[PDB]
Amino acid sequence: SMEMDEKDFAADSWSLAVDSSFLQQHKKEVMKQQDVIYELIQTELHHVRTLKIMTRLFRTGMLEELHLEPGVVQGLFPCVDELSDIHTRFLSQLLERRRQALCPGSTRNFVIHRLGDLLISQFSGPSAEQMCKTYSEFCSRHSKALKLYKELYARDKRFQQFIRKVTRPAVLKRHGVQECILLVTQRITKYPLLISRILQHSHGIEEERQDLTTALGLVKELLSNVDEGIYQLEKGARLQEIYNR
Amino acid sequence: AIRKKLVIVGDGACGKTCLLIVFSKDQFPEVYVPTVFENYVADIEVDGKQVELALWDTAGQEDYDRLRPLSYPDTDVILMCFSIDSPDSLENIPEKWTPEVKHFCPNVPIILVGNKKDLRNDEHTRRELAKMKQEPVKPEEGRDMANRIGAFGYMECSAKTKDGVREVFEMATRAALQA
Secondary structure (H helix, E strand, O other), X not given: OOHHHHHHOOOOOHHHHOOHHHHOOOOHHHXXXXXXXXXXXXXXXXXXXXXXXXXXXXHHHHHHHOOOOOOHHHHHOOOHHHHHHHHHHHHHHHHXXXXXXXXXXXXXXXXXXXXXXXXXXXXXXXXXXXXXXXXXXXXXXXXXXXXXXXHHHHHOHHHHHHHHHHOOOHHHOOOOHHHHHHHHHHXXXXXXXXXXXXXXXXXXXXXXXXHHHHHHHHHHHHHHHHHHOOOOOOOOOOHHHHHOO | OXXXXXXXXXXXXXXXXXXXXXXXXXXXXXXXXXXXXXXXXXXXXXXOEEEEEEEEEOOOOOOOOOOHHHHOOOOOEEEEEEEOOOHHHHHOHHHHHHHHHHHHOOOOOEEEEEXXXXXXXXXXXXXXXXXXXXXXXXXXXXXXXXXXXXXXXXXXOOOOOOOOHHXXXXXXXXXXXXX
């Protein structure tokens, strides 16, 4: 993450991020809504950071430092550029909605009133089709990636040294290779939880309640489609084992 | 410090996410309780042994039978959770959660955890359950379920008060270390 955004989302809640004199101007129900929206954006920032660890620290480091066989790095990090593009774009839209909502003279005091429309856009049309295609592919390659990682770590000294080197810093404690893969697979199933709780605190404007209801249904449609489109790939699986599925 | 992996499973109502949050902060949040849990690596020393225990939630995956099993690879210990305020959450343990965990995590120890133990003697809880001809889960009902499902053990805790939470994770660490 970049420092501006890290600082903007350093606090444990929206109510602790904003100035206390600003907080005091709002009703409790608005504070509750804003706290959950803040969690959505904060966790999206962290998800994009997970993807940057995967692309920049691991994938690109392996290509630059190690002599792995063709196709190995793609097998460890399936679809990571596509995933980075999807979520970096989504993050950009969330952060621009925040920035537009800032009070003049402030870099921290805002209220987001119109999130539902942004979520409808993300989870419909071409962007939703791309999310579905990319997660169906990634999640079907998940087992294969973990098994390839374990094999290389156990057998290739320079690979082991590389991993131990770049994962030594304390700030990588939660973000080894396998941990990053599972964080990414689990991201998509976080969205209904977050959206439903935003919706619980968004009844004051009926247009907003309606838009978040529509968004929640689109997100669940995406997840159902991804779930039905997964079949785990296995290195060395024979045709007979597949057609006897 | 050796690395081990913990996964928590159970119904949405079981309080799994809250349990992970409270353990990882050593604190019930005073201002905002998070909706979601990403992951965490806890430094635990149990019986003189140092472990890095990676923590994972399955919240949000309960409806998605092909996504959810992606959480299970290389698990060292399972927390299988129900809420003491929800007999329904206990009834779902033996024939929904247990066969899935035994399939994807063979020979992995299971600790059955009764969450929300503070609500066993809560008057609101008792009134609400009585209307469905129910009452809070009794300790013997918890133990008997754990026995039946082949659990490593049975434990209770309260994320709200923090009572019992440390002990659950220390025991999970011990279970993960067993050969």
